[PDB]
Amino acid sequence: MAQIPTLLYDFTLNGMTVTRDTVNTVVALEFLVNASPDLLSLTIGEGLSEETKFKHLLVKHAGMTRKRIEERLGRISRRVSVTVDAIIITNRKGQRFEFNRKQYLDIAKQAMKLKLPGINCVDIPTALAFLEEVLATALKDTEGSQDDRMALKADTSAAINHFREMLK
Amino acid sequence: KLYDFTLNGMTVTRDTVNTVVALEFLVNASPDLLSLTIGEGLSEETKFKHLLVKHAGMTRKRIEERLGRISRRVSVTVDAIIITNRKGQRFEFNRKQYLDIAKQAMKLKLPGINCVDIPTALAFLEEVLATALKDTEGSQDDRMALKADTSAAINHFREMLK
């Protein structure tokens, strides 16, 4: 077993206090609905089920700092509504998309623990979705050093190719 | 071959390497990277403890590679380990105190995927999947879906490197 290394109510959203778990689910769903088709494709790729899209977006956002996810919450707070039973996302045209809170809080807990129900393996695609965020963040962190960026790409490329060969 | 390591002309043990490397990460990793790798809500000592045990799990080849790349940002003195950030600011840590904390950190068994080094994390996932794909008791349909989904995830990951 493995899990996302980033592990209540200490966040605020539309005048109400919420958990980090709720914030992560809200921000992931809002991105799912309102990111441009191009940004969504670049972020998670194509051919995923809606629940798997959420899982991969969730673990990327669950790694954000408090500071950065509070900045996100502020930017999108007016687009979201957390009710007793639902998380409701409004798109740029005013259409509302309802997501069952229970259902997505359970999906989120699966994803944070990299669990696949009924399958004896870590959720490898979700773990790789998280590692993509690690890579993207480490790459920005080198952008004033061509050497450090090259070493990071070369070392990661070697590892990802070794992992390709294992499946070939 | 040298049993210990060389840092800025000084012979240092793996214990010192692990502590230097973890402290350099703590100081110079972006807050975004730190959150991804160890989470938040940790005290300053606990941040180091988590970073220590994670870097201690890196192979010698990978840690010796890291050591070379950070050597220009670190200094080991009798009393202190000194980390310099990209702005020239110096952050100093009592060397004996943090070597002692490191011995305690070595006792931690953390559940998070260890991603202070991305190849290390990918090697863990590769091993875990190889095991699952070989235990043919369970569902062949499940295994073929997992293999297909993982290949697609690897292809999406690869795209970030071009």
Gaps in chain A with C–N over 2.5 Å, residue before each: 7
B115 neighbourhood in chain A, CB within 8 Å: 5, 130-131, 134
Question: A68 near B32, Cβ under 8 Å?
Answer: yes
B16 CB-near residues (< 8 Å, 6+ apart)? B5, B7, B76, B99
The nearest alpha carbon in chain B to A143 belongs to B86
Upper half-sphere CA count for residue A62 (Cβ side, 13 Å): 29
3-class SS at B4?
coil
Q: CA A130, A133, A135 angle in degrees (round to 5)?
A: 115
CB contact under 8 A, A134 and B33: yes
B65 neighbourhood in chain A, CB within 8 Å: 151, 155
Chain B closest-CA separation from residue A52 CA (Å): 11
Task: Kindly tell me the sign of the dihedral angle through the C-alpha atoms of A64, A65, A66, A67.
Answer: negative
CB contact under 8 A, B69 and A148: yes
